Amino acid sequence: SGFRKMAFPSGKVEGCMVQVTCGTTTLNGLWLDDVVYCPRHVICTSEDMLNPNYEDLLIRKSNHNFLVQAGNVQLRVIGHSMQNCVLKLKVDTANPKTPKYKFVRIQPGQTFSVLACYNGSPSGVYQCAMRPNFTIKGSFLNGSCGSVGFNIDYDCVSFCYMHNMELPTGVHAGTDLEGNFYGPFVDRQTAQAAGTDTTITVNVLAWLYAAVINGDRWFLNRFTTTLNDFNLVAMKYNYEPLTQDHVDILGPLSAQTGIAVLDMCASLKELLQNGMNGRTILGSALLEDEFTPFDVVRQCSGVT
Amino acid sequence: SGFRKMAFPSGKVEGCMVQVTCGTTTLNGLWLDDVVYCPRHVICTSEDMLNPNYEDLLIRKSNHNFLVQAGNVQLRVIGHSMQNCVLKLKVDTANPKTPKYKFVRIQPGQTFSVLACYNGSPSGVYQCAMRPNFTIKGSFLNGSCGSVGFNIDYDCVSFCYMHNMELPTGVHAGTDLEGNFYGPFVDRQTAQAAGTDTTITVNVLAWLYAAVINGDRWFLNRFTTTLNDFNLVAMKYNYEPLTQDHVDILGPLSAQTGIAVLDMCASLKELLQNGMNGRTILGSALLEDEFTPFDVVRQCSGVTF
């Protein structure tokens, strides 16, 4: 028993991380088959970043201007193409450590593991949620750009995130592996509004189920509610509205614990209206929204 | 910027995890050079665990009673020895994925990464603190026994923990890789007192420094305090007493932020006396004690490997 914010084992991703250098600028790349993926702002100086014309900047560059190092091995770049906000560097060698992999665009509310890297070398691994406003609250210092987010389904790595920038607010924005930003962000150093963020309601309910399973039951009340009644309270506290799709996803946790989803909603409603009175749930003094229903099921059934 | 509870990259450890089976019982083993390490209670049935004589139980077993599988490959066991609460199974093949490694006994308050495994297959990775009472608050289901805790210093994996048992209270106890339990625990299914836990004061101060560095500064006061004055408040709130050794370890974070350790102590004192008034520090509504001063420095300076 017990419940922890758990990342996927990072081994399969560690073997794909490389260093990409273009003039002064060094960041991280993802080496899969004979292609290296990295943020296109590798081609920018600190001045360029204020208002870059990426097409014009990339034209000034040739294959030999891209230094790609896999640990101590230097890769030979035989091609370069821009796809949205990512650069695809064709190299002469297939990565022998290429795992079975997919590129996926994740939905807001979904979670993934980040392997934070500097100069193509792994620093650490942690589990993130994509916020409803398409930002992440990561740990990303200078040089962390090109660090990737992923899920693992047995043998298959689903790459969903490549770190691109820190907004002035200190929150993080990135792209899928086709180089399309999550949210309304562009790769230039301007002030950019992230939307109003909201709490991921289905994740909070999943974590309350995790709590009951591990024997934290104090918050279970004598009340029930309707989807409509609950959603009026959700709106007031900046929680995502709960849909029948969400109720359906919580079904297995409902079945295990014998607490109907709407009964757990009534518990959450009372927590929102009355706060927690300085009590804790699974060692947290606030409501946690970075566990999906699938995350709770994985951990509470020991999937490998 | 930003601050997260970060585990070490688990790649070097993943390649060392194997499945060990002895009759009915299956758990995880650590394959380094030509030796597999696992908890000795692999040789026990659920009945044996109530009051096991490990010497007598191990004598009933030979090399061929130990099934060791590395993914899909089966290893040949040519030797078995009991060292404290761990079994060392000598195998005919050196692990070609053996990293540079050390066995270290960690101190209470120190942190490490756990690779939670089932049937010799990695499930997930997370950062733990060894509690002052030598327990850990992990996530460990049936079959997680033999899962290991580690730190990485560039190329070298320091194995410090092997998961052994869940206490009736749902907290976790384990051994070093020489099989010596952390704390007063034994490998039998009895009621065992963990004894009073305390908050790791030096870790809370380190995390307050992490907070200042990342721009959370609301808790900073101009009140100050003495080691003696602070430790009277520490005792009242079940915090470890702060020593000069602890002040010295926080020195670099003090130097970076320009906040003297005793000033940060006065901020912590008011947080303890007055609570946080429903505010958050680095997205937490309570005081976090599972980051060491070295953890904060590593993350706030981007150390790799």
Author numbering:
A (entry chain B): 1 to 304
B (entry chain A): 1 to 305
Article excerpt on this structure:
Mpro is a cysteine protease that mediates the cleavage of viral polyproteins during viral replication and is a high-profile antiviral drug target. The SARS-CoV-2 main protease (Mpro) is the drug target of Pfizer’s oral drug nirmatrelvir. The emergence of SARS-CoV-2 variants with mutations in Mpro raised the alarm of potential drug resistance. The X-ray crystal structures of the representative Mpro mutants S144A, S144L, M165Y, E166Q, H172Y, and Q192T with and/or without GC-376/nirmatrelvir provide a structural explanation for the drug resistance.
The structures of H164N (apo and GC-376 bound) and E166Q (apo) were also determined for comparison. H164N is a high-frequency mutation with 4682 occurrences and remained sensitive to all three inhibitors (<4.1-fold change in Ki). The catalytic activity of the H164N mutant (4.2-fold lower in kcat/Km) is comparable to that of the WT. Collectively, the results suggest that M49, T135, N142, H164, and Q189 might be able to accommodate multiple mutations without a significant compromise in enzymatic activity and drug sensitivity. S144, H164, E166, H172, and N142 mutants impact the size and hydrophobicity of the S1 binding pocket.
